Amino acid sequence: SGFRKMAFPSGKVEGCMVQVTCGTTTLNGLWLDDVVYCPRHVICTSEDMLNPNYEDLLIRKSNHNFLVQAGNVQLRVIGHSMQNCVLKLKVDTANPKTPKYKFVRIQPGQTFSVLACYNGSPSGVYQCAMRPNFTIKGSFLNGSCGSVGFNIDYDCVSFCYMHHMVLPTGVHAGTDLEGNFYGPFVDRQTAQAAGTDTTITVNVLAWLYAAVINGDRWFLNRFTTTLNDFNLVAMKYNYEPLTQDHVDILGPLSAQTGIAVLDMCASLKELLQNGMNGRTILGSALLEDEFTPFDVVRQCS
Amino acid sequence: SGFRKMAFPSGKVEGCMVQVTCGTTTLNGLWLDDVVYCPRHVICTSEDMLNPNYEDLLIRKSNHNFLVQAGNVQLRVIGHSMQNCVLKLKVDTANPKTPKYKFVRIQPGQTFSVLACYNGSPSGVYQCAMRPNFTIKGSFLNGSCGSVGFNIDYDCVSFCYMHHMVLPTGVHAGTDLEGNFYGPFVDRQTAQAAGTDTTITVNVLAWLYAAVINGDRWFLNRFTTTLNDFNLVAMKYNYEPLTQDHVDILGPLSAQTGIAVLDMCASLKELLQNGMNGRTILGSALLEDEFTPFDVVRQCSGVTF
Lengths: 301, 305
Ligand SMILES: *[C@H](O)[C@H](C[C@@H]1CCNC1=O)NC(=O)[C@H](CC(C)C)NC(=O)OCc1ccccc1
Ligand SMILES: *[C@H](O)[C@H](C[C@@H]1CCNC1=O)NC(=O)[C@H](CC(C)C)NC(=O)OCc1ccccc1
Description:
The structure is a homodimer. By secondary structure, the first copy, chain A, is an alpha+beta fold. Chain A contains eight helices and 13 strands. Among the domains of chain A are: about 15-90, Beta Barrel (Thrombin, subunit H), CATH 2.40.10; about 200-300, main proteinase (3clpro) structure, domain 3 (Orthogonal Bundle), CATH 1.10.1840.10. In chain A, the strands form two sheets. A seven-stranded antiparallel sheet of chain A has the order 5-4-1-2-3-7-6, with no helix packed on it. In chain A, strands 8, 9, 10, 11, 12 and 13 form a six-stranded mixed sheet that branches. The site of one ligand UED has 16 residues of chain A, from strand 12.
């Protein structure tokens, strides 16, 4: 039984991580079929990081300026182009370990696993979530750029994040695998900051349902609420507003437990009002918001 | 920047997981060289699990009673043996994905990654600590038995755990890969209780060091304590004793942050007697104790495998 933050097994992604070097800059690349994807700022210099002109910098490159190492093997680059903030390096060998995969852009509240890598080698795997302010709370050091976030439902890897930068509060920003940033950020070192972050309300509700499924009922009550009254209260605690779409998505969990979604919304209002009074819920003394409805069902069933 | 509960990359282990079926029972096996390891209770049936005679059950089994499936391939079992609570199945072909590895037995308070599996198929990875009462706080459903726990060192996988059962409180119990149980548990279908658990003091201190390294500094204070002074208060709060080896282990972190271990113990002493007074540490309202000192050093310096 039990309930834990769980990442996807990382092996499918480990077989795709390579090292990419251009000049003095090394980061990680993602080798799928005969294309290596990585953040375009690997072509920057140290004088050209406030206002890089990427199209100008790329034109001055040849294939042989890019050193791509897969394990102890140099891959030969035969082409290069830029798609948004992602560089695509064509190589002369399709990766034999390429899994079934697709590229997907996720919405705020969505979770995914991150394979943190340095110098093309994996360091560790963890779980996290796209925050409402389009950042993620990762664990990343110098040289982590090009690490990716992913889901594996079925035997297919969905790549949804590539790492590009750290913001002044210590949270992180990056792109989908088509190189479009999440949020308003840009890949230069001009002043940028995360907007105020909020709690992912539908995820907290999912996690309360997970608590009921595992046998906890101490936080329930006999009250219900309207959707509108719930959001008026919730937003006073910096919670994201709950939409009718979120209510629908909670239907299965609602049905499994016999607790209406608006009844569970009433429990949450009380928890925000009272705190936990020294109790814990699923091993936590805070309300957890990085489990989706879909994660809860997958881990409980 | 940032700090997360982090597992080892699981790829080397994923290549070893297979499905093992005996009669009506199906669970996971670990395929290394030409031997599959899995829990011995795979040979039980309904009536048997109440009080099994595993030797008697095993002698009645032939090789062909064991269906081992590795992805889409059936593996031919040519031998079967038992070591403690682990069944070993010799197969006719070595696993070409066998990594460098060894079997190790860990100590309570040490951490490892679990690869939860169902029908030989990896489905999730998470980081666990062996608790002082020899349970682990895992997440496992029917069919999870045979999932394994491990650490990585350079390129060597150190297998330390194989999953066998769940206890009434929802925590879990298993064996090392030589089939010796962790904790005072037996592999039969009976409710068994774990002892009262305690907090892993040296890991709490490691995590406070990770907090400081990430700029979370409000719990620091001007005071220090002594081992004997601190331990007297640790006992009171169901905290493991802090030994002299624990202090030395924390040396690197202590010298990296400028906070001597006994300075940090004074901070932890206060957190125990006074609580956190509405504040959090690394996003937690509780004192986290499932990061060892090595875990904090590895994550904060970017060690790779
Ligand atoms: C690529 O590996 C790197 C990742 C940052 C570095 C430290 N931790 C991370 O997650 N990206 C950059 O250094 C990035 C490049 C720009 C062209 C976007 N700049 C960046 O993140 O600057 C802020 C910063 C850099 C170094 C230390 C602290 C903050
Ligand atoms: C092996 O896959 C299984 C793991 C349990 C199943 C539920 N969650 C787990 O971690 N082990 C057992 O079921 C175990 C087998 C004995 C022969 C040692 N027995 C056990 O403790 O089962 C408790 C249970 C009760 C009701 C439903 C499911 C399990």
